[model samples]
Target: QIDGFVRTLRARPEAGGKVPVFVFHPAGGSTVVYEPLLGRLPADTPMYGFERVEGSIEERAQQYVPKLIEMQGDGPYVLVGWSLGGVLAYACAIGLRRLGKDVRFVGLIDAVRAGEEIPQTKEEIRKRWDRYAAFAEKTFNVTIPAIPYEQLEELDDEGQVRFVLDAVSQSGVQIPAGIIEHQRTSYLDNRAIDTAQIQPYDGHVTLYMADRYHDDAIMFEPRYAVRQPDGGWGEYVSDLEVVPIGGEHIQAIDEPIIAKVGEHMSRALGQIEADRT
Candidate 1:
């Protein structure tokens, strides 16, 4: 059942019986992306996902803290986030610690390090747009003609959304207007969250990085990809353990690749449960 900000992706028999894992939504603010990974976790392991909350990074994380405690009631929480969700998860962990909560695990799935600057030059932005256009075409099987940045900048936010929608419509693909609007809002919100300042976390973090790069056109830059051993979390997390997962950023969460991620997460949760006992 979905209530307010929390959606129970997988429910357990008893509340707080086991270490409940909380997952943060990615830029699209959709919890369904984590479904495949959920199938990989232990069936008895309770899992929940958060929807999009508007605010600064800290404020968003703060909002989830109370909701989290209400559901699980106490310490020993397991937090997981992918992409933009990772940043929120880190912030959530920091907020939990401040409140004297016990956070046993923090997992980041190919999330960029907080405070990293995104490429913002006009040329860079256009480059990203071109790449994303190609990616959209391939992913959706629709042809998206390029719209110049100068033309795009002239339109208001709604007009911009409509403009893109029209472009997609021209290719005979019909996507709902509401969906496009939501995606626009989510994209902007994701930028704000990614650029937000996050305090350093003084706990152990397990980073599940994609072995391959997300060469597709998207907000994630290839240059800052998670190819590094630490996935850039070492600077923010006091203790970090890096685990390599197969596939690119998006692909990593699907099919055969997600199986490996699930196996690793199950093993980690098992160990945590044993240690607690």
Candidate 2:
């Protein structure tokens, strides 16, 4: 089984017809990346997430495909991908369909399309990755030492995993060690969704484009990625509708971001519920 994963969620909402909520993490991020979403999604939805695999960078790298298959089993459900998770969400949706599961809606949260290629040259990436690499070191360093200082220092290793996940639901990019590796691996490796692979997902998809981006992405690369010149998301998915969510990538995890997205998801789910009954 894919790392025999576990979910980091709180008390679920009452079963609203056992609707399933499948959550994915960003590159190098664990399913706990959705921690800020505890109790925020429809309670009636059955919520579960695949935990981060306990492996070094290499072990997790080799295990990615198998773990992806495991994520497919968590459903017959709606899929949501954040960053690198978006690629898996698309692949799993296709796999689940082959297995006769219902992958109703897909939410690509601040991620590039599954099939969309990076298309940048090595020099181009050197410019961007260099900046992001710096952001990475800075982002995690600050969050690392402060773990002991949390109001409670409540969770142990595993519990801390859950806490860290939920914490992102608010704001800031305080990534964990395992997820940090995943994030690094994301840029280095995520070649899973090639051009042909990403096309099938015209499925109910929603792209929550980011507005205020990170220091590296705080401006427009209108030449390549989407998002407006005013620091908004660029439109790539014409088959799907685009909704602009204001906030930097990390802050988008906080309220209005979480709650507002929940509201959008609710509306989408309402449509599905209507189709069923």
| TM per prediction | 0.80, 0.60
The TM-score leader among the candidates is 1
lDDT of each: 0.76, 0.53
Least lDDT summed over 10 consecutive residues: which range in candidate 1? 217-226
Q: Write the per-residue lDDT of candidate 1 for residues 1-277, one digit (tens) a residue.
A: 7889788887767434667789999886588889999899987788899988877888888898889888766678899988888888888889888888889888888875523456656666566557666766666676777675776656544465567667767767777778666767765665576568667788989888776556552334556543456776677777888888867777867898888878988998998889877
For model 2 the local lDDT of residue 8 reads: 33
Report how far off residue 45 is in candidate 1 (Å).
Answer: 0.9
User: Which portions of model 2 miss their true places by more than 4 Å?
Assistant: 1-3, 8-17, 52-76, 113-129, 136-197, 216-238
Candidate 1 clash pair list: none
Q: Show model 1 residue runs off by greater than 4 Å.
A: 14-16, 113-119, 122-175, 217-226
State model 1's lDDT: 0.76
Best by lDDT: 1
Judged by lDDT against the true structure, how good is candidate 2? Answer: 0.53
Which 10 successive residues of model 2 have the least lDDT summed?
Answer: 229-238
